Design a protein around this ligand. Sequence first.
Ligand SMILES: CO[C@@H]1O[C@H](CO)[C@H](O)[C@H](OCc2cn([C@@H]3O[C@H](CO)[C@H](O)[C@H](O)[C@H]3O)nn2)[C@H]1O
Ligand SMILES: [Cl-]
Ligand SMILES: [Cl-]
Length: 139
Amino acid sequence: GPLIVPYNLPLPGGVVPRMLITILGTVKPNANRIALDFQRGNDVAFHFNPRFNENNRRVIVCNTKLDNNWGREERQSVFPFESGKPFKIQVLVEPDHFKVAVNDAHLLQYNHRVKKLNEISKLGISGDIDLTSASYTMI
Ligand SMILES: CO[C@@H]1O[C@H](CO)[C@H](O)[C@H](OCc2cn([C@@H]3O[C@H](CO)[C@H](O)[C@H](O)[C@H]3O)nn2)[C@H]1O
Ligand SMILES: [Cl-]
Ligand SMILES: [Cl-]
């Protein structure tokens, strides 16, 4: 049975290198967006935002939100998600960046702008997905 979206996954004591977060789900048909939000309190340390129809293009927007202001976006035109299809997102925390693979293929990395990794204590998962699983493990 699917989890309820938007879904909140506590990250006890924040994130740390060698921490692997795995999100399993299926994209809804005619999906418009997906969002992962690694949060430090109200701040979003790492925002991972696949957009299925931005001016008829598919793009993943990544960014950080500090004191309610979004920063400079990082955009990646490789777009492995497809409406209707099951996906696996793996977010591996490394010393200098978040490393994201989708369906076992490296997708992008996002350098740490928020430095207090052990305060990034919650992951919000939202958008047009049926969420199957969300978990973490130390590798
Ligand atoms: C290609 O240009 C863009 O096209 C967009 C529509 O597809 C919008 O018009 C953008 O400007 C408005 C905007 C800003 N944002 C926020 O960006 C955050 C990450 O930086 C987060 O994703 C945040 O949720 C989200 O609302 N969303 N829309 C515009 O810059
Ligand atoms: Cl699609
Ligand atoms: Cl910080």
